[PDB]
Amino acid sequence: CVATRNSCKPAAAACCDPCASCYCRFFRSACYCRVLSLNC
Numbered sequence: 844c845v846a847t848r849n850s851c852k853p854a855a856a857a858c859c860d861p862c863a864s865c866y867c868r869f870f871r872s873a874c875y876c877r878v879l880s881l882n883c
Contacts, residue, residue, distance in 0.1 A: 848875045 844859035845851075851858055851865040851874035858865060858876040866877035 845876050848877050851875050 844856045847860065847863065851867070853865070860876045860878065862880055862883035863876045863878035865874050866879060867874040
């Protein structure tokens with residue numbers, strides 16, 4: 844699955860990260876699983 848800051852679109856298993864979240868950027872079209880905790 845998606846390790847980190849790779850891809851969001853959680854189809855079936857491409858965003859494994861219970862310590863992160865689906866973050867988006869300016870584009871807002873290519874979101875990825877980014878850890879917005881900085882604690883894990």
